[PDB]
Design a protein around this ligand. Structure first.
Ligand code: NAI
Ligand code: NAI
Ligand code: UGA
Ligand code: UGA
Lengths: 402, 402
């Protein structure tokens, strides 16, 4: 089948390559760099499986900047563009998704549009009324960065929306798409759920909010443990042996980061409007409180030192273990708070070439010089190459993952 | 070994019977009824395994009101008395545990005292200083009511506290006790953790608080679902397929109830004092908000009816599925809120013989009359015997469990 995918990020590229094994895929983007990379078998992001598929699999995939040409030819269009949370409007800025819907509808009268980008609850319904069509459905995406294609090869589940009174074509396409994902998976028993759009939009926001809830909870337990001089690993291990709690996704950090959890928890809170709740709002505030607590602990360690200048060395800015980006990295907010103090900040981050011109932080990518200059080394996740300066490293990492 | 157990409740009786297979157990209580029942092979509470063991196993177990005689003879004393949360003092009322420690210490100079009752973080340390001894340790209890003995036959884990500078005897007893629990289990691979008292006290409060967090979260998702006319089962099923979230302990209700979750979440919040957090306090408030929301939904359904008198029929007061008690049952708080309105309340609850004299609610244990009189039937968990009046039943139960 001829499929067009809007957006070549983690989601777009993962799905485009997944679907390119037995379908004719065209990935659309507005960045020439990504288009040329893809057209030459190169992945714009670090991902073991995407890199492997582009390099060694028979794929029917190409990229283009020509939006209209790609969408006109498509039988199905998958939308995977950004959906940033905008603090000014207290909501997701859905312009990049809407602009694609408009473009697709203006040149294609038969294709069903499938949104993979995380969206507000009620968005499909709002878009269907705005554009006066039923050819728009949602299929949430659950992949994790660094396992973008892997998670669609071995998905937890597949969900696609369909409304009772949708046209036979849209209903058939919703089903066909769910089955294209199922058949492309290498995993044998993948649950497939077909539900209303609002239910599906809710699934995605409530699932990510639960993951943020869990990180936030283990981080508050960790705040307590550090404040009371208790062994955090012993306590976490003790509660995690209850299989209703579990030994996964329970490693303390400076806060939940990444492009997704921060913005999605905020979006869910907004969708609640005045519906009664107290936990949803606390999951968002808990991250802020955790970050401020971490900043104060660092500040207190520093004032216990006798040095003319106090220098904090930040070891890495990656948003989680094995990440290739710093989107909403928790340590960056901690840094912001430390900056309001008389503290010099140096950053060790190989993936970065230069800091923005106004940044007062100083990038020191020679590890040895970095260790020498830092009075204290702050890092979200520990790494063995810090072994020789271990006694001046501050981190709440316990399990070395996530 | 000669073991004395203080308290014949779910915890005390479960452990006393468990340990009575290969040890000489004496259970102590202040209620003559419980002592006579136990001495005659009868369980004071409903529990399939305890009833089976008392009736068909070779047990070395007896009960007595004679506290001092039991404690003087003991080699180990297990304390399983109440630890209620007291709203006036903003803390657990630990008098029943302290009174037992005092009694044991006054007549026994060698036995180590093991607390199974859930206690405040820092309590062992406080008690050790108050009584000036190190012969007091904590071993949290994780059993569920209705599976009291079953959960100790198949425990998730075993935890016993020990401090680095405790006497060789207390350290040896801490270990021996952990191994008495391990060897008495029928489960083969049970993790055994030895940790500091404060860490162990924290494990118990943080584990129960996570279970309350989970119930509170799925209940807030349910509030949202009902408010927006969405299918709650579809949404919950959709997020639960993520194995990091899970298909367990996720059934909506009128709130988390039982003697334990309500009081333990409140106790943890108190132990936090001013340590930074926002989630811990929200887990407690979320229950209140959920209950008030449920009461309003019922009130709204009622005002849509044209009857001279509006009657709400409450189907059962049990605190959870298969429970034999109503401790902190969520529906009771909902009832309290409905009472401030012009609503007649009738209750169907076979396990109850009479309501307190001042109660304006009326107990109607003839099911047929109950169904006839109720304009709307409210219940925490559905039951098939309500099939014929299904259209007037209000419940948020989805999965028929917990
Ligand atoms: N990153 C992840 O792990 C997951 C992200 N999501 C959601 O999927 C959406 C995309 O996320 P990512 O893939 O991480 O984003 P990304 O930022 O990595 O990639 C977005 C791409 O879309 C391109 N783009 C912007 N406007 C476009 C337009 N008008 N037409 C065509 N291309 C356009 C951008 O140039 C960029 O290459 C977001 O809503 C995100 O919340 C969902 C699951 C996982
Ligand atoms: N019920 C449960 O599922 C679990 C309860 N726990 C904790 O264990 C403790 C006990 O809970 P339950 O067993 O449910 O209580 P319960 O209320 O069922 O039983 C307590 C028993 O102790 C007796 N008692 C009171 N003072 C006594 C004294 N001074 N000397 C001797 N006996 C005395 C009472 O008469 C009563 O029979 C509480 O701290 C509870 O939080 C821990 C795990 C599970
Ligand atoms: O919607 C999305 O975009 C995706 O967001 C997350 O995936 P991802 O953002 O790649 O990252 P996670 O591995 O979930 O971690 C998120 C943040 O929480 C933090 N975290 C996670 C787990 C943990 O134990 N501790 C912890 O601090 C991580 O360091 C990271 O900053 C979800 O796991 C995906 O299912 C979802 O599809
Ligand atoms: O400390 C205790 O005393 C015990 O408390 C709970 O056991 P229990 O109180 O018997 O009851 P649960 O089955 O945990 O249920 C607690 C409350 O949450 C509610 N709940 C639970 C699960 C769920 O999916 N939905 C839900 O509403 C139940 O209806 C009930 O009112 C814990 O499960 C035990 O591990 C712990 O040892």
């Amino acid at each position: 089948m001829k499929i067009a995918v809007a957006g070549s990020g983690y989601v777009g590229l993962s799905l485009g390559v997944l679907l390119s094994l037995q379908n004719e895929v065209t990935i659309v983007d507005i960045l020439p760099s990504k288009v040329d990379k893809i057209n030459n078998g190169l992945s714009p992001i670090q991902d073991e499986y995407i890199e492997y598929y582009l390099k060694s699999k028979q794929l029917s995939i190409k990229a283009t900047l020509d939006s209209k040409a790609a969408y006109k030819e498509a039988e199905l269009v998958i939308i995977a563009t950004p959906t940033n949370y905008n603090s000014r409007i207290n909501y997701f800025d859905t312009q990049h998704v809407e602009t694609v819907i408009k473009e697709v509808l203006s040149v294609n009268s038969h294709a069903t549009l499938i949104i993979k980008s995380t969206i507000p609850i009620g968005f499909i319904t709002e878009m269907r009324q705005k554009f006066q069509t039923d050819r728009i459905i949602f299929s949430p995406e659950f992949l994790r960065e660094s396992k973008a294609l892997y998670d669609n090869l071995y998905p937890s589940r597949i969900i696609v929306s369909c409304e009772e009174n949708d046209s036979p074509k849209v209903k058939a396409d919703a089903e066909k798409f769910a089955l294209l994902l199922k058949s492309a998976a290498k995993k044998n028993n993948v649950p497939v759920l077909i539900m209303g759009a609002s239910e599906a939009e809710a699934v995605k926001l409530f699932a990510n909010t639960y993951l943020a809830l869990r990180v936030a909870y283990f981080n508050e337990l960790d705040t307590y443990a550090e404040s009371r001089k208790l062994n955090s690993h012993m306590i976490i291990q003790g509660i995690s042996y209850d299989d209703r709690i579990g030994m996964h996704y329970n490693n303390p950090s400076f806060g939940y980061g990444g492009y997704s959890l921060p913005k999605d928890t905020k979006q869910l809170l907004a969708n609640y409007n005045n519906i009664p709740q107290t936990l949803i709002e606390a999951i968002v505030s808990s991250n802020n409180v955790r970050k401020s607590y971490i900043a104060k602990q660092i500040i207190n360690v520093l004032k216990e030192q006798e040095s003319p200048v106090k220098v904090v060395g930040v070891y890495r800015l990656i948003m989680k273990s094995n990440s290739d980006n710093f989107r909403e990295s928790a340590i960056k907010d901690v840094i912001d708070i430390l900056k309001s103090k008389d503290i010099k900040i140096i950053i060790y981050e190989p993936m970065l070439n230069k800091l923005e011109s106004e940044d007062q932080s100083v990038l020191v990518n020679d590890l040895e010089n970095f260790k020498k200059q830092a009075n204290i080394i702050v890092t979200n996740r520990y790494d063995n190459e810090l072994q020789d300066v271990k006694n001046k490293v501050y981190s709440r990492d316990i399990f070395g993952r996530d």
